[PDB]
Write an enzyme that holds these catalytic residues in place. Sequence first.
Site, PDB file in Angstrom:
ATOM      1  N   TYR A   1       0.820  -1.202   0.000  1.00  0.00           N
ATOM      2  CA  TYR A   1       0.000   0.000   0.000  1.00  0.00           C
ATOM      3  C   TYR A   1       0.859   1.260   0.000  1.00  0.00           C
ATOM      4  O   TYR A   1       1.963   1.292   0.549  1.00  0.00           O
ATOM      5  CB  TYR A   1      -0.934   0.005   1.212  1.00  0.00           C
ATOM      6  CG  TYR A   1      -0.251   0.310   2.527  1.00  0.00           C
ATOM      7  CD1 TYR A   1       0.424  -0.680   3.227  1.00  0.00           C
ATOM      8  CD2 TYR A   1      -0.298   1.585   3.076  1.00  0.00           C
ATOM      9  CE1 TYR A   1       1.045  -0.406   4.433  1.00  0.00           C
ATOM     10  CE2 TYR A   1       0.318   1.868   4.278  1.00  0.00           C
ATOM     11  CZ  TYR A   1       0.989   0.871   4.953  1.00  0.00           C
ATOM     12  OH  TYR A   1       1.603   1.150   6.151  1.00  0.00           O
TER      13      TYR A   1
ATOM     14  N   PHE B   1       1.341  10.688   3.125  1.00  0.00           N
ATOM     15  CA  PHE B   1       1.782  10.591   4.511  1.00  0.00           C
ATOM     16  C   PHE B   1       2.555   9.306   4.777  1.00  0.00           C
ATOM     17  O   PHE B   1       3.482   9.307   5.594  1.00  0.00           O
ATOM     18  CB  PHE B   1       0.584  10.693   5.459  1.00  0.00           C
ATOM     19  CG  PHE B   1      -0.374   9.535   5.363  1.00  0.00           C
ATOM     20  CD1 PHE B   1      -1.333   9.491   4.364  1.00  0.00           C
ATOM     21  CD2 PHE B   1      -0.323   8.498   6.280  1.00  0.00           C
ATOM     22  CE1 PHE B   1      -2.215   8.430   4.274  1.00  0.00           C
ATOM     23  CE2 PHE B   1      -1.201   7.435   6.196  1.00  0.00           C
ATOM     24  CZ  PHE B   1      -2.149   7.401   5.192  1.00  0.00           C
ATOM     25  N   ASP B   2       2.198   8.214   4.107  1.00  0.00           N
ATOM     26  CA  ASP B   2       2.858   6.934   4.310  1.00  0.00           C
ATOM     27  C   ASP B   2       3.060   6.246   2.968  1.00  0.00           C
ATOM     28  O   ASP B   2       2.311   6.474   2.015  1.00  0.00           O
ATOM     29  CB  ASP B   2       2.050   6.025   5.251  1.00  0.00           C
ATOM     30  CG  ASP B   2       2.775   4.734   5.583  1.00  0.00           C
ATOM     31  OD1 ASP B   2       2.711   3.787   4.772  1.00  0.00           O
ATOM     32  OD2 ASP B   2       3.418   4.668   6.649  1.00  0.00           O
TER      33      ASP B   2
ATOM     34  N   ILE C   1      -5.944  -0.632  11.219  1.00  0.00           N
ATOM     35  CA  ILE C   1      -7.132   0.207  11.316  1.00  0.00           C
ATOM     36  C   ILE C   1      -8.301  -0.487  10.612  1.00  0.00           C
ATOM     37  O   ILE C   1      -8.116  -1.265   9.668  1.00  0.00           O
ATOM     38  CB  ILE C   1      -6.860   1.605  10.730  1.00  0.00           C
ATOM     39  CG1 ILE C   1      -7.962   2.591  11.128  1.00  0.00           C
ATOM     40  CG2 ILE C   1      -6.705   1.550   9.217  1.00  0.00           C
ATOM     41  CD1 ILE C   1      -8.108   2.768  12.622  1.00  0.00           C
TER      42      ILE C   1
ATOM     43  N   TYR D   1      -8.122   7.504  12.562  1.00  0.00           N
ATOM     44  CA  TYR D   1      -7.585   7.704  13.901  1.00  0.00           C
ATOM     45  C   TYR D   1      -8.503   8.535  14.792  1.00  0.00           C
ATOM     46  O   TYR D   1      -8.055   9.020  15.837  1.00  0.00           O
ATOM     47  CB  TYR D   1      -6.205   8.360  13.825  1.00  0.00           C
ATOM     48  CG  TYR D   1      -5.206   7.596  12.988  1.00  0.00           C
ATOM     49  CD1 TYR D   1      -4.598   6.447  13.477  1.00  0.00           C
ATOM     50  CD2 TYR D   1      -4.864   8.026  11.713  1.00  0.00           C
ATOM     51  CE1 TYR D   1      -3.682   5.745  12.718  1.00  0.00           C
ATOM     52  CE2 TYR D   1      -3.949   7.332  10.946  1.00  0.00           C
ATOM     53  CZ  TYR D   1      -3.360   6.192  11.454  1.00  0.00           C
ATOM     54  OH  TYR D   1      -2.449   5.496  10.694  1.00  0.00           O
TER      55      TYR D   1
ATOM     56  N   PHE E   1      -6.500   5.167   0.140  1.00  0.00           N
ATOM     57  CA  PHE E   1      -5.606   4.029   0.017  1.00  0.00           C
ATOM     58  C   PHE E   1      -5.643   3.484  -1.404  1.00  0.00           C
ATOM     59  O   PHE E   1      -6.677   3.518  -2.076  1.00  0.00           O
ATOM     60  CB  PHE E   1      -5.980   2.922   1.011  1.00  0.00           C
ATOM     61  CG  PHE E   1      -5.319   3.064   2.351  1.00  0.00           C
ATOM     62  CD1 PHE E   1      -3.944   2.968   2.473  1.00  0.00           C
ATOM     63  CD2 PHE E   1      -6.072   3.302   3.489  1.00  0.00           C
ATOM     64  CE1 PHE E   1      -3.332   3.103   3.705  1.00  0.00           C
ATOM     65  CE2 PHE E   1      -5.465   3.438   4.724  1.00  0.00           C
ATOM     66  CZ  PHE E   1      -4.093   3.337   4.832  1.00  0.00           C
TER      67      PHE E   1
END
Lengths: 237, 107, 79, 288, 745, 96
Positions: free
Chosen positions: B26, B36-37, B56, B82, B99
């Site tokens: 991912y 962000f990731d 999550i 979150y 995602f």
Amino acid sequence: IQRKAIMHHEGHMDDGLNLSRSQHEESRTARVIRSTVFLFNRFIRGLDALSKKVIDLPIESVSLSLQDLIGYFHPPDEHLEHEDKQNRLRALKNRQNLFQEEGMINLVLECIDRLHVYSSAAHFADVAGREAGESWKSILNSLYELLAALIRGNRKNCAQFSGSLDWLISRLERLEASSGILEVLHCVLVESPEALNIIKEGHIKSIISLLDKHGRNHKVLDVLCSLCVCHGVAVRS
Amino acid sequence: GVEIETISPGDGRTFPKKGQTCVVHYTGMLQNGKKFDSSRDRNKPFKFRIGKQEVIKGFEEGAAQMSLGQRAKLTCTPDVAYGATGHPGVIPPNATLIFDVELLNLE
Amino acid sequence: ESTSNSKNVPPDLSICTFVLEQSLSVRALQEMLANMKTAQGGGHRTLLYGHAILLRHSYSGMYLCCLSTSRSSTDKLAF
Amino acid sequence: PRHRAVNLFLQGYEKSWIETEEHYFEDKLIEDLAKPGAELPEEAMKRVDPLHQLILLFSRTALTEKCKLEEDFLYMAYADIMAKSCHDEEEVKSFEEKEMEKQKLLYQQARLHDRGAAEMVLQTISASKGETGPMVAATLKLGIAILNGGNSTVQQKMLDYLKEKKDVGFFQSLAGLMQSCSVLDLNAFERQNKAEGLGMVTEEGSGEKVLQDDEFTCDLFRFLQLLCEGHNSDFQNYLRTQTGNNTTVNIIISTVDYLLRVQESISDFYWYYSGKDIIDEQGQRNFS
Amino acid sequence: DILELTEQEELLQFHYHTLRLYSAVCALGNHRVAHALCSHVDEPQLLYAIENKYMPGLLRAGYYDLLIDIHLSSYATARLMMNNEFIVPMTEETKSITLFPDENKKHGLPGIGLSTSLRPRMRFSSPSFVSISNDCYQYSPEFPLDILKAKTIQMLTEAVKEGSLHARDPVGGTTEFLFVPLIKLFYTLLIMGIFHNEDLKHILQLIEPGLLQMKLPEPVKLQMCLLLQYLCDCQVRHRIEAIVAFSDDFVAKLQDNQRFRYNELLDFHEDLMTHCGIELDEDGSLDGSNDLTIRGRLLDLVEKVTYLKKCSSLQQLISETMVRWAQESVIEDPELVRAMFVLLHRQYDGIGGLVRALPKTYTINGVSVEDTINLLASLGQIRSLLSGKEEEKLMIRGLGDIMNNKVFYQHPNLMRALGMHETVMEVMVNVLGGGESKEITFPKMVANCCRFLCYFCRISRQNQKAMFDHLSYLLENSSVGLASPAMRGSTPLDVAAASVMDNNELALALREPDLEKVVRYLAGCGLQSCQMLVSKGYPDIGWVEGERYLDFLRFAVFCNGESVEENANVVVRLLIRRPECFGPALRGEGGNGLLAAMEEAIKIAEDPMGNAIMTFYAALIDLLGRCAPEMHLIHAGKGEAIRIRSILRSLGDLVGVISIAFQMPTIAKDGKVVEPDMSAGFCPDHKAAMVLFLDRVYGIEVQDFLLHLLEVGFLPDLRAAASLSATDMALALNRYLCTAVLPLL
Amino acid sequence: ECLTVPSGEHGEEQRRTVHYEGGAVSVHARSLWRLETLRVAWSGSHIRWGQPFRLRHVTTGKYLSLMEDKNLLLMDKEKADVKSTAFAFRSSKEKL
């Protein structure tokens, strides 16, 4: 330790003033320190007595005295021999200590700085006289560097200025302001944990909002770096 | 709610079991094109067991919809996120996630 | 600084105590183009009438001079 | 094998017994190797000697005061190195061998003190105001190594330095160091002889604790004696009054009081030994 | 873009300061900050940033500092902290090492070889960003190490080729920006220990034959000096491991050679060196000078170690390069000069390095390796937290973990060598330093300075002696709050008492000014009030004042069963030169009115504290009794004995204390079924002070006094007879009657 | 226990008390007094064992003057006495 002269006619025979060698060592240096303290105290006292609401306010005398005080507490520069630099630093430290432990002046220097009720640089200037209202940056930066070099030596008065937490919040402001005093205070010394821990969530958020409101100052990042580890003693302490 | 927009089909019938790990690569990005990731650039895939709350809830539910070898494009409402507090320092509070997972193998 | 000596209003002398320095002749003008100090005098030379003198303040550390400015609450050609 | 204390027992055999070979090595060799004149610059000061830079570093570190002398290991190592370099000292040629030894010692002292070695020692002594740390011991060892034989040049350099700098803390530090010097301290011996059972049965530590630092006191007084050797009398007149400085202290008087203290201690020790028959070895060493 | 900033200002400075903020906010070890910043900057971003040749020097330095401070900064600091330790286990590979590689024995490669020292644990983690935990330990994830290992040496070869070519365009600005971050990353990777084997051989082939022959600026010289220091440290570690192998084989050989010759009068009975003298006394005595034929190998390996090296190795190159650097020009930056001369002296004094490294060396068994590793990790955490607000909980956890460890009490010498004494001392100084009220009050560091340290270590004439050094600081700051004296009153005095618990030599070594100080602190409690447990205000708690001082003085004056006369004289002199207690029976005098003081205490016990005053008086008289000279035990002729006896007897009133010792507020307490008041009421051992003073000063010198007293504890005897119930007064009354051995005289 | 003038906003408001207090004030010498002589020509003489000299604090302009109650309590520069400000130095012996 609290005594008095008294001694009507004949007092106690076991009394003799033992003179101390104040000539040399202290000498010209301490003499001009005391005289400058006298002159500055009298002049700024006359100013703040005149500064109590709108005889005309001196301006040229203020600028001349401020420039002379800037030249008095100047850094000793780097393009000099080590022994000369050390002698100049020791003399400057004696200057600061005699300026502080005597009539402090710095506390009523903040009283001079207190006149920020103008907030416009146009209306107070012309209701109180002519010009002025702009050389305040010179005052702020100059005596900020004064306080910085004053603490810089041997942990002189970090707690003395940290005790003005309300006035630290007052100095925390974003309106025609320079953050030099905060940076030098955070850089110079931690001393008591107050100087590095009274900066609470509100203070951090207000400094962050200073960054957000104004432009990229590039100097707020330096003090924020200094708000982290200071002397290496902040190893998770 | 899962809003899967599949970009490439996969097996068509493979579904992740309870005792299985979804090996994915991912590269989920926040809104306004903010990454962000990224798990692909680290050259290490992600493992997580379904039903153990190790990931999550949005990532777990999105993996429960794609097939084997099925390139996916997921999104995450602030419900499966979150929360209103948000991840400290990386995820702003009350934000959505996007995602684009790509399951390599199912084990 | 007016000085009447009425034992009740003392005068000041620190602001008045001057220290003089190297005394040269008028033909010893120095400033051949460029010139630090590099003084060429032993010192303690007695000042003779006509010698160019230098005054230095014992407290303020500066030198008494004739400023290039004007006015000073006066209306003339003076400095 | 778990309690293999041999690794710590070998430390006693290796600390000094094998260190003699290295002590005979280096010292003068490295001292002359690291100062080969003006180096090889191939270019006024010829980029300055390396040990001149080292002495300047030590002097400027001593000048940067912090109201407390540190415990730098470099000072220890290099003060010992210069002391061993400058202290290379039956019937021989009374006018040839002696003169050659004197010339070699003068050459070594000149090499050391031509780069401000006296100023370093003087500043280091003036820094520690009465603190009897090992730095003062190393500095005094270097001083007696420099002044071995009583050179007039080093005495003149120290005198003119103290005159031009008006150093007052140097004499105060000397007075404090002499005041903090130890004494025979008969009570310590009285407590010591009543050890575990009788004698040092436990052998936990062979520390003196009765005469603390005899070597330091001997080195300090030898430095003071060499400071006035040769009947220079300029130091003798200066050391008595220090008329150049504002504060006047009499080191001669303080030496007299220290002599009084050691005399009283020796007399007390003898009277404690009075009435006994045979002097023990520990009392023999303390008396010596 | 990024390369456009090389000509635009006000953005390069701001981004450089942003990188500085990113590095500084994650300094000195951090957990949440590292993982959070692992999102803003990524692994491929950092690889491309260090890869670029046209990047500005400021951004290059900032990115290198950020990479070092985020990814590889905690384990490097831990290894640098634990480098000076030389903990070596016992394994067949440990004794298989040789000092020299082979019979050629020229120099040997410093980093190449076999190492077995107990190093801290390498363990990284993963960022994940959708998971739980992974933050508390195992800092910022493993930025890949093999690709870093390859790329660093590749572009270091490129950099040294460019430097040898003497180009006019370095990677950044001047050559400083080109070289300093590279050598910094190289040094950090080397001290991490990742470089080894053929990679380290290639490194040595690259930096020797090397870049030292070229011209370098000052910071590059500093970093190379640091690298050479690390190399010399590795060489010293190799020497230490060789010494460990030799001292593992030869110790067993000499153990056999000493066990076989046990007894085969005698030749001075061997001074009992076989059995009663096999300790460090034997180890010093069993030297290699003249004993058997075993000393041949000892001398051979002494020569092997002192080949002046491990002239013929890297030392000559190091010294020559240092001399050339000093010769080239004058050197500023006095840190560089200090490092230069430190390295030179270290090269010329390898025996100094050996004698420095030897005392800290230790040999741990191979069965407790994992426990030793865990204890070392706990100490590393403690040292990282050394010199907080909420780090106190982490320090408490670390101290509790180090409590429940076998290595602590099974190896006390190792504990002392590891230097936890100074660590705990610095922690306590930082905690209580500042005055006021000791804001972070949680005194467990005093319990650790005490407790297992100086209890399970059993001093061995070394641990308590080392603890005795900080006695002045311990007694000076007599703070309050520890639960050991029930309520507050003395946190460090327990440590002070444990320092001189059962060491006669340390009790003799106690100085008079310290006792004078403690006497002054005891005299400072010249006050009395009707509150419950007040000290200066707020009488809140209703559940000891100078009793702790009296207990410390009792521990200092009485060691084993014996009373130190030298301490006793000054203690009693300073006690009588300043009266302490407030005795109402004396009234006119300073105090010690025991005739009515205990009566008033027992009257106020059943009134609106309680045992406090009685316990204080009992501690005072117990201290006085233990302070009394030994009655004919050692001396009975004359001299400062009858003098002190008469001084104690003067306090007439103390001659007759029968009405206090044999007093009858015995109180059956539990009696039939209930009311077992432990808190309020006199203890069965409360009269132990009475009987101790009597036996020490007066004693039963004649049977007439015994008949006058008849039964000493007559009402205690009646209570003991009535005790025939349990779980009551009888439990301690049995001990009190057992301490009444004075009938056996 | 040198003569000291109060400060910390106590000075220039009271500015009369002459504290006979030492301590940290000594070396951080707020307690400093500059003396002036009545004579102008050769004012800075070596000073004999007895001669009058006026005293002024280096930080406060209040000249040292004596009151009728054998105490000083300072006085302003523009208001000084003729015999309570002379302060003639005293030789080794008393009684004039």
